[PDB]
Amino acid sequence: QGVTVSFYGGELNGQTFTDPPTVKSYARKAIFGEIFEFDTETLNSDGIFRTSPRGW
Amino acid sequence: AELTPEVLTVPLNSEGKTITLTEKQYLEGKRLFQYACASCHVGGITKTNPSLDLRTETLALATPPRDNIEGLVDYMKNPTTYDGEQEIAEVHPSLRSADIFPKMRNLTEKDLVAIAGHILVEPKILGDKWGGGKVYY
Amino acid sequence: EINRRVQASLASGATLEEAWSAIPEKLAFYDYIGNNPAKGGLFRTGPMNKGDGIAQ
Amino acid sequence: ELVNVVDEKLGTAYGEKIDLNNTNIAAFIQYRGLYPTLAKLIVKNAPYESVEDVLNIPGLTERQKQILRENLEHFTVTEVETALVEGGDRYNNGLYK
Amino acid sequence: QTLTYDDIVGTGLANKCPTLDDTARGAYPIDSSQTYRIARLCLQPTTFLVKEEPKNKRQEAEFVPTKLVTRETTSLDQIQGELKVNSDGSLTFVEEDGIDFQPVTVQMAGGERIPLLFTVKNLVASTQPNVTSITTSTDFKGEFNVPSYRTANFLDPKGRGLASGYDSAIALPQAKEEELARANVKRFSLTKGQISLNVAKVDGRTGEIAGTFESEQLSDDDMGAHEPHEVKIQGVFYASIEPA
Amino acid sequence: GMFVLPFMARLGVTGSWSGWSITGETGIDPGFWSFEGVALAHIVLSGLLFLAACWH
Ligand code: CLA
Ligand code: HEM
Ligand SMILES: CC1=C(/C=C/C(C)=C/C=C/C(C)=C/C=C/C=C(C)/C=C/C=C(C)/C=C/C2=C(C)CCCC2(C)C)C(C)(C)CCC1
Ligand SMILES: CC1=C(/C=C/C(C)=C/C=C/C(C)=C/C=C/C=C(C)/C=C/C=C(C)/C=C/C2=C(C)CCCC2(C)C)C(C)(C)CCC1
Ligand SMILES: CCCCCCCS[C@@H]1O[C@H](CO)[C@@H](O)[C@H](O)[C@H]1O
Ligand SMILES: CCCCCCCS[C@@H]1O[C@H](CO)[C@@H](O)[C@H](O)[C@H]1O
Ligand SMILES: CCCCCCCS[C@@H]1O[C@H](CO)[C@@H](O)[C@H](O)[C@H]1O
Ligand SMILES: CCCCCCCS[C@@H]1O[C@H](CO)[C@@H](O)[C@H](O)[C@H]1O
Structure with a gap:
């Protein structure tokens, strides 16, 4: 289908990606809603969602 | 919704002539299809060869065309491969092979028309479910 | 609310880049499933940061 | 680096038409007259440098040759992909209904 | 005179090639x-x-x-x-x-x-x-x-494959993908x-x-x-x- | 950091049921008296002595 992804606002503002694995990678993030950059190293984060104090 | 004459109106031949089936013919078609065909063709698929289904679009692209009463009745007498190239009576149930497919022995010309009508009407009712397999259950 | 703001920006004559760049970081962040309290697990312990990471 | 070759194949003509060098045999059912007789011959005599070369299969009847000519527009050829032709996958690729 | 299936079945002989004297x-x-x-x-x-x-x-x-x-x-x-x-x-x-x-x-x-x-x-x-x-x-x-x-259909224990399967580690929705490239891309x-x-x-x-x-x-x-x-x-x- | 392995090896127990030997050989057969068999024997001895303690 020749799917591309363009970003508006944020870090990637003005950029367009056409590489299918890159575009797919962003689409996987888009199922979670708005896309963020995370520091996963400082806490050795495991990539698995946790609840908030509201949940607890 | 109702099983109307319009639903029961299907192509009789390759020219464009239609035939309108009765509710009795519909019932008979389902009964006879279950009797002789369903063990392999339940829900419009083909258990022993899933590549070929009983969807009207598939039948239309068969050789000779099978998307009409005449084509289907002829198939039930002298079944062929999808390209028309080989006669498969020896491995497919037919009037021609009623000796080795004994359930075909008591099927009349009237019965064949009913079964053919069932095959054509069913997708008009069930849509993509007919010939769809488990995905559509 | 994000969409409302973007549409209003566009209606007022902003480009798509300007419209999205006017969305506050904090508002975008609420529109992300990682902050939904119904996404955790009983034995997935600790801060939300321990899962997806510290948002940057 | 690391690429899924089947996904990449989907970005070529293989994703648009029946690829005579790669596509599983059940795909020939999409068009009149191709399955099973011609489909078997096409897969058996692969690969082809061009689509037209399908007309060179030994033993074809004149009707069969004409059916092929009428369908050339629905065919393509790309490089043989090991992952699609190994395991007898052109004859049965593990997909039914 | 000559060995049959039932003479051979379960003996191990069916995995042996014929010999010459x-x-x-x-x-x-x-x-x-x-x-x-x-x-x-x-x-x-x-x-x-x-x-x-x-x-x-x-x-x-x-x-x-x-x-x-x-x-x-x-x-x-x-x-x-x-x-x-x-x-x-x-x-x-x-x-x-x-x-x-x-x-x-x-x-x-x-x-x-x-x-x-x-x-x-x-x-x-x-x-x-x-x-x-x-x-x-x-x-x-x-x-x-x-x-x-x-062959290409084979799915790993997390359901990842080449001609079928997931293309990521779905149990780790927000993990960084680079380190898992070799396992993710068959x-x-x-x-x-x-x-x-x-x-x-x-x-x-x-x-x-x-x-x-x-x-x-x-x-x-x-x-x-x-x-x-x-x-x-x-x-x-x-x-x-x-x-x- | 092996502490008991050297004491088994000192008096002739050098092989594992898994087929290795501490001298670097492959495909050796240690019989029952592999490192594992020695371990097993001591566990069974422990149990027998435990029961004998109860009786006494
Ligand atoms: C109302 C109680 C309560 C709640 C909702 C929270 C909530 C929170 N705490 Mg706090 N905390 C509490 C009381 C609470 N705390 C108490 C009493 C202490 C002292 C022990 C602490 C000390 C503490 C520390 C040190 C930390 C937290 C952290 C956290 C966060 C992560 C929670 C987590 O991972 O849980 C995990 C929950 C479970 C694994 C579920 C427990 C299930 C038990 C074991 C069930 C027992 C079953 C029982 C034996 C069955 C009996 C059967 C029998 C009757 C027959 C979250 C905001 C973390 C945080 O992020 O800090 C910044 C953190 O580091 N808490
Ligand atoms: C009288 C009852 C039956 C009828 C009316 C019937 C109808 C049909 C039709 C119309 C086709 C061609 C489909 C197409 O062109 O897309 C077909 C194909 C096929 N049917 Fe049946 N069928 C019957 C019984 C059976 C039974 C009992 C079996 C299983 C034993 C069976 C197995 C098959 C197979 C394997 C094909 C594909 C044949 C090929 O092209 O090689 N059919 N059938
Ligand atoms: C945590 C840790 C560790 C560990 C440890 C350990 C492992 C231990 C142990 C231990 C042990 C394991 C011990 C023990 C013991 C015991 C005992 C002490 C006992 C006893 C007894 C008795 C008392 C008995 C009695 C009796 C009986 C029963 C019967 C009859 C008779 C009599 C009476 C005699 C380490 C160091 C690594 C490091 C850090 C951490
Ligand atoms: C010779 C030999 C050897 C050795 C050996 C040994 C060393 C042994 C031993 C042994 C032992 C060491 C034994 C034992 C024992 C015991 C017993 C037999 C017991 C018992 C018991 C009982 C019977 C009890 C009871 C009771 C209880 C439990 C509880 C409460 C009550 C009563 C008291 C009743 C070897 C191998 C080198 C090699 C070669 C050969
Ligand atoms: C078909 C007649 C050619 C002579 C070859 C031997 C008989 S072939 C014949 O094929 C029929 C299906 O068409 C079956 O009804 C019949 O049982 C089968 O033996
Ligand atoms: C409690 C479990 C008992 C297990 C007994 C297994 C013995 S095994 C047996 O042992 C002999 C003497 O060591 C060797 O000569 C021989 O190679 C070995 O097969
Ligand atoms: C209580 C259960 C203990 C079972 C003991 C089985 C180990 S027995 C052990 O097996 C080795 C190969 O696996 C052989 O090399 C060796 O000859 C034999 O003694
Ligand atoms: C008392 C029961 C002893 C349990 C026996 C465990 C099998 S023996 C075990 O096999 C592993 C894999 O083959 C090896 O990596 C290991 O070195 C070896 O000790």
Whole structure:
């Protein structure tokens, strides 16, 4: 289908990606809603969602 | 919704002539299809060869065309491969092979028309479910 | 609310880049499933940061 | 680096038409007259440098040759992909209904 | 008089290639005019060796013994193909079809399991020049294809695959993907193997030959997830030659 | 950091049921008296002595 992804606002503002694995990678993030950059190293984060104090 | 004459109106031949089936013919078609065909063709698929289904679009692209009463009745007498190239009576149930497919022995010309009508009407009712397999259950 | 703001920006004559760049970081962040309290697990312990990471 | 070759194949003509060098045999059912007789011959005599070369299969009847000519527009050829032709996958690729 | 399925079933004999007796030391005439073919080729492995992979390359790596854990399921048989005569009198077997592969798992000292696709797929094997007759001096040397041990549909335990399956570690929705590239992106191996067949017995009347073989090939790489190992397979073979 | 392995090796127990030996050999057969068999024997001894303690 020749799917591309363009970003508006944020870090990637003005950029367009056409590489299918890159575009797919962003689409996987888009199922979670708005896309963020995370520091996963400082806490050795495991990539698995946790609840908030509201949940607890 | 109702099983109307319009639903029961299907192509009789390759020219464009239609035939309108009765509710009795519909019932008979389902009964006879279950009797002789369903063990392999339940829900419009083909258990022993899933590549070929009983969807009207598939039948239309068969050789000779099978998307009409005449084509289907002829198939039930002298079944062929999808390209028309080989006669498969020896491995497919037919009037021609009623000796080795004994359930075909008591099927009349009237019965064949009913079964053919069932095959054509069913997708008009069930849509993509007919010939769809488990995905559509 | 994000969409409302973007549409209003566009209606007022902003480009798509300007419209999205006017969305506050904090508002975008609420529109992300990682902050939904119904996404955790009983034995997935600790801060939300321990899962997806510290948002940057 | 690391690429899924089947996904990449989907970005070529293989994703648009029946690829005579790669596509599983059940795909020939999409068009009149191709399955099973011609489909078997096409897969058996692969690969082809061009689509037209399908007309060179030994033993074809004149009707069969004409059916092929009428369908050339629905065919393509790309490089043989090991992952699609190994395991007898052109004859049965593990997909039914 | 002659053994039947019920004589053989469950004995282990069905995994053994046919043998020739000690009097079979003849020679099978070759005629440059006539085309030949192998009607049946059988290969029965008797030992599997895996090359050790030391931490240091200064000392040479040796092939070591392994234990078979997949039982009497190892032999190739019913293999056929053209036996061509080449202008220099040499003969070339071009493998066409047959039961020409077996998945095999062997276990090294300390438990490490080595799965491999023991195979001669697409074998092209040649004799020495000027073979007027196949004798106990004739040998075949050649190369064959070793395709991926799993084919393209195979799904890993997390449901990832090449021609099917997920393309990511779905249990880790927000993990960084770079470190998992090798496990996430499946790849289909195709490598070369080498084989030598040493003819030890010939029945010139029947056209049957037998002897020993040695083959070398790579093991399973689990669709690109790890480096394969070098395997050496030794055993006995049997072949029947016919005019085509 | 092996503490008891050297004491088994000192008096002739050098092989594992898994097929290795501490001298670096492959495919050896240690019989029952591998490192594992020694371990097993001591566990069974422990149990027998435990029961004998109860009786006494
Ligand atoms: C109302 C109680 C309560 C709640 C909702 C929270 C909430 C929170 N705490 Mg606090 N905390 C509490 C009380 C609480 N705390 C108490 C009493 C202490 C002292 C022990 C602490 C000390 C503490 C520390 C040190 C930390 C937190 C952290 C956290 C966060 C992560 C929670 C987590 O991972 O749980 C995990 C929950 C479970 C694994 C579920 C427990 C299930 C038990 C074992 C069930 C027992 C079953 C029972 C034996 C069955 C009996 C059967 C029998 C009757 C027959 C979250 C905001 C973390 C945080 O992020 O800090 C910044 C953190 O590091 N808490
Ligand atoms: C009288 C009852 C039956 C009828 C009316 C019937 C109808 C049909 C039709 C119309 C087709 C062609 C489909 C197409 O062109 O897309 C077909 C194909 C096929 N049917 Fe039946 N069928 C009957 C019984 C059976 C039974 C009992 C079996 C299983 C034993 C069976 C197995 C098959 C197979 C394997 C094909 C594909 C044949 C080929 O092209 O090689 N059919 N059938
Ligand atoms: C945590 C840790 C660790 C560990 C440890 C351990 C492992 C331990 C142990 C231990 C132990 C394991 C112990 C023990 C014990 C015991 C005892 C002390 C006992 C006893 C007894 C008794 C008392 C008995 C009695 C009796 C009986 C029963 C019967 C009859 C008789 C009599 C009476 C005699 C380490 C160091 C690594 C490090 C850090 C951490
Ligand atoms: C010679 C030999 C050897 C050795 C050995 C040994 C060392 C042994 C031992 C032993 C033992 C060491 C034994 C034992 C024992 C015991 C017992 C037999 C017991 C018992 C008991 C009982 C019977 C009890 C009871 C009771 C209880 C439990 C509880 C409460 C009550 C009563 C008291 C009733 C070896 C191997 C080197 C080698 C070669 C041979
Ligand atoms: C078909 C007649 C050609 C002579 C070859 C031997 C008989 S072939 C014949 O094929 C029929 C299906 O068409 C079956 O009804 C019948 O049982 C089968 O034996
Ligand atoms: C008392 C019961 C002892 C349990 C026996 C465990 C099998 S023996 C075990 O096998 C492993 C894999 O083959 C080796 O890695 C290991 O060195 C060896 O000790
Ligand atoms: C409590 C479990 C008992 C296990 C007994 C297994 C013995 S095994 C037996 O042992 C002999 C003497 O060591 C060896 O000569 C021989 O190679 C070995 O097979
Ligand atoms: C209580 C259960 C303990 C079972 C003991 C079984 C180990 S028995 C052990 O097996 C080795 C190969 O696995 C052989 O090399 C060796 O001869 C034999 O003694």
